Amino acid sequence: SEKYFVKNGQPHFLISGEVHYFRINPKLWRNHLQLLKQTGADTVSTYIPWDWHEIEEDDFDFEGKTHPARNLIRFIKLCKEENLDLIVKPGPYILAEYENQGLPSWLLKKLSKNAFALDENGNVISPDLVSYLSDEFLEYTFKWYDKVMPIISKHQKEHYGPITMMQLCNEIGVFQWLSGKSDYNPKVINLYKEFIIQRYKTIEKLNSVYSTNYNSFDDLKAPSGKIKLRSDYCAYFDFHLFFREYYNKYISILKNKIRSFGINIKLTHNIPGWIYGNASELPMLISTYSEIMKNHPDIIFGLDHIPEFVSFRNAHSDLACNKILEAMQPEAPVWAAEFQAGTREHHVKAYAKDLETFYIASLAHGIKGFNYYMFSQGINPEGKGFYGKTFYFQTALDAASNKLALYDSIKKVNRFIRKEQKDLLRTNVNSEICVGFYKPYFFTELISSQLLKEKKLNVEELGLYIDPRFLREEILFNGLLRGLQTLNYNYDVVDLENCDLKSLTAYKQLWITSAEFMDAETQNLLSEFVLNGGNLILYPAVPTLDNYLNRCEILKNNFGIEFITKDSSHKVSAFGIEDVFTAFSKKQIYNDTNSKPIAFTQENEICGIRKKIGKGELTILGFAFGYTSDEHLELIDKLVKLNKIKRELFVSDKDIQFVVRENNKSRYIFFLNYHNERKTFNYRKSSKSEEISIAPFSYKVIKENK
Amino acid sequence: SEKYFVKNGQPHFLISGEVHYFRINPKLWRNHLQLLKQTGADTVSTYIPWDWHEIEEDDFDFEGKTHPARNLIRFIKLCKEENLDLIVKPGPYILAEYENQGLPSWLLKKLSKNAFALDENGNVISPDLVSYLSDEFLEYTFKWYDKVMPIISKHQKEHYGPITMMQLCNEIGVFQWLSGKSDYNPKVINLYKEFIIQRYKTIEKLNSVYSTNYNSFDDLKAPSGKIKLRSDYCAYFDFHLFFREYYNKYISILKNKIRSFGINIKLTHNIPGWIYGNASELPMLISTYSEIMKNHPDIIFGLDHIPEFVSFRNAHSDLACNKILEAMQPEAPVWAAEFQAGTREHHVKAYAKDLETFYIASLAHGIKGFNYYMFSQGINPEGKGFYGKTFYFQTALDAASNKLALYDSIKKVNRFIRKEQKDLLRTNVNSEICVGFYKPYFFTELISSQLLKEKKLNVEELGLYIDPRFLREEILFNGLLRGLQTLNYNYDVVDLENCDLKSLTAYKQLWITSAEFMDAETQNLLSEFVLNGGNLILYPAVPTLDNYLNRCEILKNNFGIEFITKDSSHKVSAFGIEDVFTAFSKKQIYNDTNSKPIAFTQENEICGIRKKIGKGELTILGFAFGYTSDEHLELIDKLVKLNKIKRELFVSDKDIQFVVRENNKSRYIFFLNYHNERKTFNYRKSEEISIAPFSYKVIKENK
């Protein structure tokens, strides 16, 4: 039951390369495509920039009449002649370091002020940032679609053309996020007001949930400024729910317009979130797509992976991202829409010997397809570069089509993939550990993020102590997920929203990283999980509130837990491990009733217990740890061993990472050395040892038959 | 001309290793010391924690009466028996992940509220954070000194003991930096009031500078909250000046107490500022010691270098720090008081093969001595660790004195240093480029920093557009200095404060990264520099204000410059380089009378000129660039070549870094490969070599 791309009823590993026809001498297009095809790639991918093709208002060139590199039609025909399928991405936004993020200069000069994204003061956030549902923006976007979409429709696979997939716009919300400010455009504020009225029906029902005293819906304003009251937190939480409906409305309007041209190819979107070589904020960005992914089972999201280097400093980012995409999109293959090749930034180097290891690690970490971004360097024509004349460096081909060092790395990886794809695509890893993904902890991009200008959320002003962003970044992403990968314990991630109990019962352990708040549905689901036979690990808090910070003690009551919150030293003992550094002075102190106490404060008060409940097992730790000391890995190891979970291999060097992937025919062992040390080690299957030497920042792959 | 440590009247490379006796089984103290000596190290360094030796109020154990590892006397005796010099660091603060940052629990329980650093509301900032000038704190510090300083005094080299240097406290001001919170203890604020009265004399004089409306000094309150007005900026600027005097007053009280015991050895302090493997904030921390460095020629500041890894991502950090320290401390050797060995953080790996390259790069980059921190891992006694049981990982030795991978790297590097030190220590680089260090741009630790979550400085609210922290981090540290190092052009840094004109005339170019504000003394210095024959490169602004944001147009008027500030596309052309991305829409558009236009907006307005002024040359660019594109390296290269400055070598691979260090007799060529690529190249003076990833090669040439 792996999800993978299919060609002609067989597993197909999607290998694409990004080649920007608009940034390459058209006399050299065929050579770029030939050299991409010779790496074993089956697809080529490109933006079709609106600014490049609508050269003035209502003046379109797709044929090279005004500039040879405007000859889109020729580029499509060459893709077909060179036996490559094509991914097209006509925007309206492309980003792509193209001036004005791809929008025509003539359009941005003509639009009225009310087309732009606006701050709470009514000021333009950025002269190239439109409001997505601006009437004026969508009118011109539709006139662009009227010209580019008939060309895309004509050249679809079903009409014997090369076009197999199309991206809608580009990384929806990426500008809101990087600008560090949210959109208060009056189109947006009016849709928000309709959303609130639809959700609550009467001002009395809203007031009962928020604890506000409004006389009418007319008194309610879009939340702005810092959160000081639980009522401000409630208003912002609904504002987050509203933006997820808003982005779903935007993509819905583009999709409906596209389908009217007879375009039946696969539609895609692309997920932002890596910055400075780590992806700890990507889960927040993927959370902004929650309503798109529920409403559009036919739009496949892929990841935009930008590792920059490949070391222990970022080894956990790509696996945690691939797992979280699978959790939110379990019916489609995990794929990278943009899979780092070379570097966007001259000063931020991308070494072939790093990216080659990233590519192999991505296979170990369950990737099923990717688009090398950028396969071909470009030169910006006509001053169209946002930041300088050259587009990307250290790619597979330079802009002239010369092979660079990365070319042989990509050929090596592609060769292995083509040899193995029939088995490799069908392989699974045996995960006995499931980690819960509780989307509401991620809904903070308006109030708390690595990129937001103003920190609007301070939980201590709300009488709370567990910050949801600290929890999801340090206790979950950089803590538990980093620790399991480092310890070589396989895990899966599951979305807790509308989660079937039967999709949890296959695991030996469910791990829940909990704040003081959790909705009644999720508190009930976890209660039933344990009563019915599940083994639950829960920390750092039993929640006592719902998503609106109103009382909800369902899980606490169903588990027969009594506790008080007390201050103590950061250090606790747990399972006989002394001096376990914890994030908070405040801890939950549990009554010892019908339980085994397994963690103790410096005053020897009980801050963790284990108990049997119905047919299940509960382990609660009333303290927070991520992975900032060796004791944290010893603790994760102790917790995993409570249900006798074993690693697949005994490996003599604990700093070697491995993944075993297998199906009925084939076993693949991936060894990953994320460290600057030549390592010699030995290993054997958990149920005569082989010796292996591995270079710094390198990999080995062993195939076994049966 | 070079500054360096000396032993037996000859150049001595100071090689120290940090070994915490209080964190190591005393049965193994001799084995740690023997293994340290066997790497070629000459010195061992440790804290002497106040909490560890004053076990209860007025109960001192330096002999291991109450715990074997309190036997400081025995550890000192062993250093001498094992032929190691000793650096001691008795605090009172040690940090060192030691509970309460080294202060005794009994002390923190007993101190009155007014001994603590307080927020603006009079609340204790942190239960282990004292006010440095608290009468009660200094009294207890003095009683600690009365017990530990006679021991240190007796064991000086002078008395054929091992002790050669002592550190005073530890990273003074580090807690104000990491929190972004200033101490508003009423004793501190009374000292601030005295500082302001001393500076301005009369309320009329302060009102004229600040544009305030006070009737007397009684109206004046310590600044707090966000800067909304130019008068708030002025008050915060003087609050930064005050803290530099305050730290000088604290270290002076400790120094005078220490000297009273006949302690005549070298006194040290240590400079923080690395975080996550880069050091772009460390110049801000250096700037907090301006008054100490002016008033104490005999206190040697060393750097705390924490690179974490070694690559092109952070290659420029250690050179820029070493150059800025030399600018502010020209009469002492540049040395690392804490020189990364292993890692403080289990999850933040320190590879032997990375740190070996860091140690060699540090030699290329002018370091004259260092203390491997941590040479030996520690185990925290009886939960005295702030964090877990273990102190550091991937060190040279584990806490049990097991050799680890880094041991053989340090022995290798130390063997090279000992072989070359007599000649290597006497070498300098030939810099024809001078880069100005304007300290007031750095005086922001209370209002604008990488660590400060909520920014108190927003220059747009003051009618400005060039933020001094953006300028000093992106345009200077990660832009010009990174670019010059990448291009293999030598530079020196000079402190512009009280700067001698004759020191600037050795250089072919002086580079000044300028905001809209610059004091009259510095505007006059740069005016005289050009009129006398100097070549000045000045960007992104001709300044028109002084440090209090009052009109000052001395440089503008002396150079016959006129400009209007106008908005345009971010991209400009300069010296025929198209598509140069600049930081701001706002640019200076220059009148070009008597000038040559050399940079243009997208609409061809003049945003850069060259000019002859007296006997000298002016290049003014009205736009800001760092290093974020290949065009930025092209522009720096063109600017350097305006005065015919040449690299010392032709090296066939432009991504190889080199440093040529020479004296009259000896030349060293350091080749540094900061890239994950085996590179093969050739070199010649303005021959074919292979260097591993993240590695080095050193060539000697006799002259």
Ligand SMILES: OC[C@H]1O[C@@H](Oc2ccc(O)cc2)[C@H](O)[C@@H](O)[C@@H]1O
């Ligand atoms: O690195 C921050 C983000 O950077 C984005 O790139 C940009 C590059 C330039 C720009 O002006 C805005 C965005 C990527 O598309 C996204 O995947 C990534 O998460």
Ligand SMILES: OC[C@H]1O[C@@H](Oc2ccc(O)cc2)[C@H](O)[C@@H](O)[C@@H]1O
């Ligand atoms: O990494 C930030 C700083 O961390 C400092 O260590 C500390 C870490 C935490 C803390 O609360 C106090 C000090 C280092 O001594 C200093 O050199 C460094 O620049």
Ligand SMILES: [Ca+2]
């Ligand atoms: Ca003039």
